[PDB]
Subunit: 69 residues, 2 copies
């Protein structure tokens, strides 16, 4: 895994799968205490943002993905 995602994994998040997200972000689906989490890697491969991505229509894309799984 990319460094920030690997570092997050070492802090108790299990990484489940990767996905391509919009805005040039690479997505990682993980779990923290049996709850789904989405982590987004910046283009440089060096930073990652754990949280919820919203689009131009106000859709919470992360919820969509986590709920689907």
């Amino acid at each position: 895994l990319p460094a920030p995602v690997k570092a997050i994994e070492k802090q108790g998040i299990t990484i489940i799968k990767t996905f391509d997200a919009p805005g040039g972000m690479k997505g990682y689906l993980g779990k923290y205490q049996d709850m789904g989490v989405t982590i987004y890697l910046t283009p440089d491969g060096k930073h990652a943002i754990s949280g919820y991505m919203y689009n131009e229509k106000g859709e919470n894309l992360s919820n969509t993905l986590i709920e689907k799984e």
Copy 2:
């Protein structure tokens, strides 16, 4: 305010300040308790949450701490 940020705003987040974030993201500091929102370079997507660096430091916490 970008469209995706307006949509987080609707959930009871007030936007206070912008900042330059690593990884080429545009940062927005808001309040609910401090929150950080990161806009993608295309300006059409935004992520409410916490940014971590290469060694797993939570960068958002530090920023929110300083306000």
